[PDB]
């Protein structure tokens, strides 16, 4: 049963990685199953519950990709639009030919993993992009980057007239009944906000430019189970543009190695080789490992049901992982208040979902 494989996998993982608190949801034949361990606050012995909020880190990129997909489905943007269409002050010559597709899929030509920590004002942000010099031509190399998809999210909402948070709330969170999912945790919900732990110290994510767009969502294990269900079976969503946007986020725009780049989501063909995904999540020590040549998929392949769809995410004090297999109606969410190595997350998720086929 589900309980046995979950306990048999997560209990050693928590011990090996010294994880202070953890929540897991397994989605199995259209129903969620929840598990919690440990503490949201170690000192106060406040337990992790199904209402504890965890920082999703870069799992937030799946929300940004879906929000962008919804804007496409609304007719507000196209991925073929130039980035300058929505930010005309981006007059620097290197931006000719860079599209929203490039920003969304990390293929603009070497935008850096992090926005520099010295970027504080909007003028600081404009100068950063104006001074950026691409290492490669657009649409040739994938370099995973907050400064890339973060800007995609910020520009994707410009035709709506809404802020990124208002757009995300009204167009994604509220239609899917994610009523305990936040970019900015409101004061009444702070009692539910777990502490993250980095080297035994309690921490929360630090402010940064494009934080909301790139890594800034906090959510419960229940809302994330609903998130996985909605992305696994979009045809069950009654909001047409949101259903379409969810589908567009699992389209395959680029191929590199064994994986395909969606909007936020990343996909591999199912059945998936576990070494392919465990190794693909490892630490990229060498510079060359950060850039991957991409093959254009034109037109993009519409969402393939026989896929392993997944995304890792971390902040200073949290580590999260989401994966699902639409063909098998199977998925998992793993939220922890410690940033522990990605390969450990993927291996545990693999063992659980493999046992449930």
Q: Which residues does residue 56 pair with via DSSP β-bridges, in sequence order?
A: none
Taking the C-alpha atoms of residue 338 and residue 325, their distance in angstroms, rounded to an integer, is: 26
The annotation status of 185 as a binding-site residue, yes or no, is no
Taking the C-alpha atoms of residue 320 and residue 62, their distance in angstroms, rounded to an integer, is: 12
CA angle 105, 147, 174 (to 5 degrees): 75
CA distances from 219 to 3, 23, 116, 213, 341 (A): 23, 11, 26, 15, 21
Taking the C-alpha atoms of residue 90 and residue 81, their distance in angstroms, rounded to an integer, is: 14
Name residue, tokens 């080789």. Answer: 273
3-state secondary structure the chain: CHHHHHHHHHHHHHHHHCCCEEEEEEEECCEEEEEEEEEEECCCCEECCCCCEEECHHHHHHHHHHHHHHHHHCCCCCCCCEHHHCCCCCCCHHHCCCEHHHHHCCCCCCCCCCCCCCCCCHHHHHHHHHHCCCCCCCCCEEECCHHHHHHHHHHHCCCCCCCHHHHHHHHHHCCCCCCCEECCCCHHHHHHECCEEECCEEECCCCCCCHHHHHCCEECHHHHHHHHHHHHCHHHCCCHHHHHHHHHHCCEEEEECCEEECCCCEEEECCCCHHHHHHHCCCCCCHHHHEEECEEEEEEECCCCCEEEEEEEECCCCEEEEEEEHHHCEEEEEEECECCCHHHHHHHHHHHHHHCC
Name residue, tokens 């971390």. Answer: 314
- Residue 44 backbone dihedrals phi, psi, to 5 degrees: -85, 0
The annotation status of 144 as a binding-site residue, yes or no, is yes
- CB of 21 closer than 8 Å to CB of 282: no
The annotation status of 117 as a binding-site residue, yes or no, is yes
Q: Do strands 291-293 and 266-269 pair parallel, antiparallel, or not at all (unpaired)?
A: unpaired
Q: Which of 58, 147, 251, 281 is catalytic?
A: 58
Taking the C-alpha atoms of residue 346 and residue 220, their distance in angstroms, rounded to an integer, is: 20
Closest CA to 119 of 131, 127, 108, 111: 127
Closest CA to 262 of 279, 245, 277: 245
Name residue, tokens 């800007």. Answer: 151
The annotation status of 58 as a binding-site residue, yes or no, is yes
Q: Quick one: CA torsion of 212, 213, 214, 219, rounded to 10 degrees?
A: 50
Q: Which residues does residue 254 pair with via DSSP β-bridges, in sequence order?
A: 261, 296
- CB of 282 closer than 8 Å to CB of 343: yes
CA angle 350, 354, 357 (to 5 degrees): 150
Taking the C-alpha atoms of residue 21 and residue 41, their distance in angstroms, rounded to an integer, is: 8
Taking the C-alpha atoms of residue 225 and residue 34, their distance in angstroms, rounded to an integer, is: 9
58 in active site:
yes
3-state secondary structure 24-62: EEEEECCEEEEEEEEEEECCCCEECCCCCEEECHHHHHH
CA angle 326, 332, 338 (to 5 degrees): 145
Cα 110 from chain centroid? 20
CA angle 164, 195, 44 (to 5 degrees): 145
The annotation status of 344 as a binding-site residue, yes or no, is no
CA distances from 320 to 56, 149, 293, 341 (A): 6, 19, 27, 10
**Length in residues, the chain:** 357
Taking the C-alpha atoms of residue 342 and residue 106, their distance in angstroms, rounded to an integer, is: 20
All residues at 6 or more sequence positions from 249 whose CB lies less than 8 Å from its CB, including other chains: 62, 65, 66, 68, 69, 231, 262, 263, 264, 265
Name residue, tokens 């993982």. Answer: 13
- CB of 337 closer than 8 Å to CB of 20: yes
Closest CA to 134 of 113, 111, 154: 111
């Amino acid at each position: 049963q589900i309980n046995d494989i979950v306990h048999r996998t997560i209990t050693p993982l928590i011990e090996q990685q010294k994880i202070p608190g953890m929540a897991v949801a397994v989605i199995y034949q259209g129903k969620p199953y929840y598990f919690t361990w440990g503490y949201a606050d170690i000192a106060k012995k406040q337990p992790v519950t199904q209402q504890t909020l965890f920082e999703l880190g870069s799992v937030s990129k799946t929300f940004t990709g879906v929000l962008g997909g919804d804007a496409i489905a609304r007719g507000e943007i196209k991925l073929s639009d130039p980035a300058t269409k929505y930010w005309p002050e981006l007059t620097a010559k290197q931006w000719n030919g860079i599209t929203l597709l490039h920003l969304a899929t990390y293929t603009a030509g070497g935008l850096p993993l992090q926005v520099p920590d010295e970027v504080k004002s909007s003028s600081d942000l404009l100068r950063f992009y104006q001074n950026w010099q691409p290492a490669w031509a657009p649409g040739t190399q994938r370099l995973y980057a907050n400064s890339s998809i973060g800007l995609f999210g910020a520009l994707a909402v410009k035709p709506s007239g809404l802020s990124f948070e208002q757009a995300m709330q009204t167009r994604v969170f509220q239609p899917l009944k994610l009523n305990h999912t936040w970019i900015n945790v409101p004061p009444p919900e702070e009692k539910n906000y777990a502490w993250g732990y980095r080297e035994g110290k309690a921490v929360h994510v630090s402010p940064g430019a494009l934080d909301a767009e790139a890594y800034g969502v906090k959510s419960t294990i229940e809302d994330m189970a609903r998130w996985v269900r909605s992305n696994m079976n979009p045809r069950d969503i009654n909001d047409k543009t949101l259903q379409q946007g969810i589908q567009l986020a699992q389209s395959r725009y680029w191929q590199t190695g064994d994986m395909y780049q969606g909007l936020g989501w990343e996909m591999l063909d199912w059945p998936v080789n576990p070494d392919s995904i465990i190794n693909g999540s490892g630490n990229k020590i060498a510079l060359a490992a950060a850039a991957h040549p991409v093959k254009a998929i034109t037109p993009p392949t519409p969402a393939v049901r026989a896929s392993w769809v997944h995304k890792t995410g971390a902040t200073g004090g949290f580590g999260s992982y989401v994966a699902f297999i639409p063909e098998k109606e199977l998925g998992i969410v793993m939220l922890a208040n410690k940033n522990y190595p990605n390969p450990a997350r993927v291996a545990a998720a693999w063992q659980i979902l493999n046992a449930l086929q």
